[PDB]
């Protein structure tokens, strides 16, 4: 399935810092996107900008895996992503509330 491909690529991105940086740069429009990077970026952007209006259930889950990872481990990147895609902050708040409910402490 294309879902399986997304899942293993997300597994790779979250495990390898080089891939995560390349992916984040692709999402932030400051680096090249591979075809899979472009596909995952579409859903991560949809998640932050629009609450994943067009994401399938598996795509939304995949986007949140990266969101929670960034909130917990790369807060500065999470802040850049939300300033770019959700400055209004309603979706940002929904995800931050979910991460806090998972016990993640978020600095101001």
Automatic annotation (TrEMBL):
Disulphide bond pairs:
26-33, 52-55
- Provide the alphabetized UniProt keywords: Signal
Q: What is this protein called?
A: Chemosensory protein
Q: Give the species.
A: Mamestra brassicae (Cabbage moth)
Q: Which taxonomic lineage is given here?
A: Eukaryota, Metazoa, Ecdysozoa, Arthropoda, Hexapoda
């Amino acid at each position: 399935y294309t879902d399986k491909y997304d899942n293993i690529n997300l597994d790779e991105i979250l495990a390898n810092k080089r891939l995560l940086v390349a992916y984040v740069n692709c999402v932030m429009e400051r680096g090249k996107c591979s075809p899979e990077g472009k596909e995952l970026k579409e859903h991560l952007q949809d998640a932050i900008e629009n609450g994943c209006k067009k994401c399938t259930e598996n795509q939304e889950k995949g986007a949140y895996r990266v969101i929670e990872h960034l909130i917990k481990n790369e807060i500065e990147i999470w802040r850049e992503l939300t300033a770019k895609y959700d400055p209004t902050g309603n979706w940002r708040k929904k995800y931050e509330d979910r991460a806090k409910a998972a016990g993640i402490v978020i600095p101001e």
